[PDB]
Design an enzyme around this catalytic site. Structure first.
Site: not given
Lengths: 368, 368
Positions: A245, A298
């Protein structure tokens, strides 16, 4: 009623440090976009000074010689403990008893020593230290860190770290930044506040796991089989590392600059990593078109950090190194504010009773 | 508008641990009054278990042999650093990856090792350690702490510490307890959260200075000259140590039990300390009758701690030792809650600008 546990959405401070525009897809340090800083190749020491001081007046001084005294086997633990022990040996007074300029000098001295401790811990005890005369051949904080850690520093590897550190320097009132501000609001010395913020960052809910996307990226050997691999992982019921999300209303601008930096620096994994990004995004938006799905920061952090020869167990510490800039600026801002943070609680436990009514009183009697 | 910086009066949690009734002059741990615990001589290990578990089921285990590895010259720093280094050597996983019973066992093991580190640090490096076979001759956590520190433990001195620790065990959502809950809410291991709470408690705004009332008490040699001395200190423009605006609507019930304990144990300073209390209170309410003036808990804490042969530089660490019970109970409660604390901020700093507009860009150019 009118109660959501966890201070969710409660305003605790007003800051002049940085503004993360979630709706406009932007991140600015004192009004300056991070894309301008990274592309124009502004080094970590200058971005540290801009966030703390508010301008490019005076950067970051180099670290003094100080062999790390803690060897716990965990880089985080080494720097959390070694930072707290700086107060006695360097004579750090509480924040209440010093002026603003002295706190700034203390914060700069402790920040750069944190980076030195991280580099020493990562290099390990089974290796002789890198001589100080070789370290001194470099002129930036980021280059000295790499020299102290790896001996010879690849210049293209240093630019990858300066790109990564600048984009991770500051991102609002994260839990570890909140912790640093709370400790500083009690009047404690700067080393005690930095040390506690490191303890908060150690919690796995502080962000993502960059190291976890590397095994997926190792399975895909060419851009063509990226769709087939993403097919397999999603069919076996597993999760896709690096996607979820949306955090920003569109994408995290930090993922933008990291990916652009990977392309500009010619990182070998770039071709395959771009192919996996579009493969994963096309699938996730196809299986569940109801959710706003984006690439997490990330994902491209793993490419940049791995390209700079940073191992998996060392990637969390590289995030902490960068965030010291945001930590110091908020500690200095909390000092000038001069207000102890002290929230409230509501009791809902048992009412008044006698000790004999409590279960286990008999044991207290037999023993005592 | 509608903004007071510092979360003042904002409700962040609901607890079932303890209720400090500011209006009724009471302090209860899980519904049990602290006066009942102190007078009935319930030892710290049992009060630790009552606060953490909610009953007198299972107390506190004794500390294992573990010579302190940190010798920084500051008792606080030694225990803050030594606690964080317990996670690697003992294999503490993050709070997210363990169940409730395992976290309770880890919290009990780290709490009792904190007390052992405090006792070792206070005893100092210039003395051989107390043999384990002598320590084992005692049966309570509080008695072992005193034996490890002083060799021979005076039984009346042990009762003074058990009285002091029980009354300082827990007092709501103090800043150091808030810090422990914030660190725990990120999923970190229990040692990281305890270590950060110690950093918060190190701040001079965490409470009073018990050591500061002892020099005043040393000036007064009999109950008769207590009024004359209080006359002099108030006439020289100085402040009276141990007295100020009321914290509880009447008095701190913790000052009550400490004073009663000093009388019951026959502490030599009791006669003179009572005389100074009534002298100071009669004066402060006479010079400014508009303020509600009470005896602070730091006043009778100094008498109890000094009677137990605790030096001045060691009195802050004796408070931290007691508060580990409240810290562990809130960490365990925060774990079951399962909600990351993450407040918000409002940007009021400079708007969007280019890097060249910032003061000091020229230096970045000349150097880079």
């Amino acid at each position: 009623e009118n109660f959501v546990p966890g201070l969710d959405g409660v305003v605790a401070f007003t800051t002049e440090i940085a503004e993360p525009d979630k709706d406009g897809g932007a991140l600015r340090y004192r009004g300056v976009d991070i894309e301008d800083l990274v592309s124009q190749r502004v080094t970590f020491g200058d971005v540290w000074a801009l966030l703390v001081d508010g301008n490019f007046g005076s950067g970051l001084p180099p670290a003094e010689p100080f062999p790390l005294p803690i060897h716990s086997g965990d880089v985080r633990v080494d720097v959390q403990a070694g930072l707290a022990m700086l107060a006695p040996i360097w004579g750090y007074a509480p924040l209440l008893d010093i002026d603003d300029a002295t706190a700034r000098q203390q914060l700069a001295r402790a920040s750069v020593m944190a980076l030195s401790y991280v580099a020493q811990s990562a290099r390990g005890i089974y290796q002789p230290a890198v001589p100080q005369r070789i370290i001194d051949e470099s002129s930036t904080v980021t280059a000295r860190f790499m020299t102290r850690w790896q001996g010879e520093p690849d210049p293209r590897h240093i630019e990858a770290i300066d790109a990564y550190w600048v984009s991770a320097a500051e991102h609002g009132m994260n839990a570890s930044t909140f912790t640093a501000r709370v400790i500083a609001s009690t009047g404690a010395d700067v080393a005690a506040a930095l040390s506690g913020a490191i303890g908060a960052m150690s919690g796995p809910l502080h962000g993502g796991a960059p190291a976890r996307v590397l095994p997926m990226l190792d399975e895909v050997e060419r851009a063509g089989d990226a769709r087939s691999v993403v097919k397999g992982i999603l069919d076996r019921g597993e999760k896709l590392m690096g996607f979820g999300h949306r955090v920003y209303r569109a994408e995290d601008p930090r993922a933008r600059v990291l990916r652009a930096a990977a392309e500009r620096l010619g990182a070998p994994r770039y071709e395959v990593a771009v192919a996996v990004e579009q493969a994963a995004l096309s699938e996730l938006r196809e299986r569940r078109p109801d959710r706003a799905i984006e690439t997490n920061v990330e994902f491209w952090a793993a490419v940049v950090l791995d390209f700079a020869r940073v191992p998996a167990n060392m990637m969390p510490a590289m995030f902490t190194c960068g965030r010291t800039a945001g930590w110091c600026a908020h500690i200095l801002e909390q000092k000038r504010l001069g207000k102890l943070v002290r929230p409230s609680a509501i009791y809902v436990g048992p009412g008044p009773r006698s000790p004999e009514s409590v279960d286990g009183w008999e044991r207290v009697l037999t023993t005592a």
